[PDB]
């Protein structure tokens, strides 16, 4: 059962510093891509993306956000490319959050410089607004009860549907400790996601009017490969991927698992190849898809290369 294939674009959790950096050098398409990603990261971003990549010493670090979220697109959007050379072209794109971003290219739905341009400018907005702001908790339990636990907090909401055992909520960080000292009360699994911002909650609507200024030129596409929006929960096959679409994915929850569900159940997809820096949502798939990762936290050279591309091809 091979079917169709779906290459899985992550959000958050997938960055690690020095993702890339051996691959810079063993592969020359993933090191081209990367090239190409700088180039068109570089009107924007003030630093240089190999300098973070490679850890130079006058880089940034991967702290912040407007950081770390061009670096993992950059990324992302060459393992896509570093597939695509080994014979494994995406009978579909699906992202989660920022994720959307890097599918939106692989996909031909944006440009490199528009993808370039909104995820530099929806994180700078991001770090300067939403950053030290909000919180984030990743929760080992459904949404059907994680909806009811989030009454009584009126600054929190659901992030994130990833897979039908685990959600992610978002919002006031003093209500984030809050919930997950309950959870951690009813004996539940509970931990707290590196974040200072709240993505997909409330307060993203403060950079709205920011966004809508910064992201108003795009021209988006028609998609060349189908994109399955984990936002609209469904294809996207007209070019309607502008800024207003840029911050709605940022505003409203994940629909992963909708995606994940209606990609396998219907359209036949069978194998999802997570193009990351690490696997997040591989544990997640129904247990009937093949689920393939890329590189894995500090094992990212030839060696995880290799060894995706094997668990690709002997599926």
């Known amino acids: 059962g091979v079917g169709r294939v779906a290459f899985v674009f992550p959000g958050q959790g997938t960055q690690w510093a020095g993702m890339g950096a051996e691959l810079l050098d063993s592969s020359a398409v993933f090191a081209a891509a990367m090239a190409e990603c700088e180039a ?26 407007d950081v770390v979220q061009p670096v993992t697109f950059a990324v992302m959007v060459s393992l896509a490319r570093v597939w695509q050379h ?8 699906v992202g989660h959050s920022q994720g959307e971003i890097a599918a939106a290219y692989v996909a031909g739905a944006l440009s490199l410089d528009d993808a370039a341009r909104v995820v530099t400018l929806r994180s700078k907005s991001i770090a300067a607004h939403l950053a030290g702001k909000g919180g984030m908790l990743s929760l080992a339990l459904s949404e059907d009860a994680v909806l009811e636990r989030l009454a009584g907090f009126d600054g929190l909401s659901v992030a ?19 919930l997950a ?24 609507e403060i950079i709205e009017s920011e966004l809508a200024e910064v992201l108003a030129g795009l021209s988006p596409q028609a998609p060349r490969v189908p994109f399955f929006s984990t936002l609209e929960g469904a294809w996207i096959t007209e070019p309607v991927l502008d800024g207003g679409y ?13 995606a994940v569900e209606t990609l396998a159940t219907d359209e036949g997809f069978t194998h999802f190849v997570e193009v990351s820096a690490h696997p ?13 990762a890329t590189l894995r936290r500090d094992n990212g050279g030839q060696d995880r290369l290799v ?9």
């Open 40 to 65: 068109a990261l570089s009107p924007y971003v003030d630093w240089s993306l190999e300098a973070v990549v490679r850890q130079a010493p006058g880089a940034p670090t991967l702290e912040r956000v």
């Open 86 to 93: 080994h014979g494994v072209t995406p009978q579909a794109v």
């Open 160 to 178: 994130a549907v990833n897979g039908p055992t685990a959600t992610v909520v978002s919002g006031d960080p003093v209500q984030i400790e809050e």
């Open 181 to 204: 000292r309950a959870c951690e009360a009813d004996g539940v699994r509970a931990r707290v996601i590196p974040v200072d911002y709240a993505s997909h909650s409330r307060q993203v």
């Open 246 to 258: 840029w911050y709605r994915n940022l505003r409203h929850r994940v629909g992963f698992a909708p």
């Open 280 to 292: 997040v949502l591989t544990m997640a798939l129904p247990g009937t898809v093949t689920g393939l």
């Open 307 to 315: 060894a995706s591309l094997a668990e690709a091809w002997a599926n």
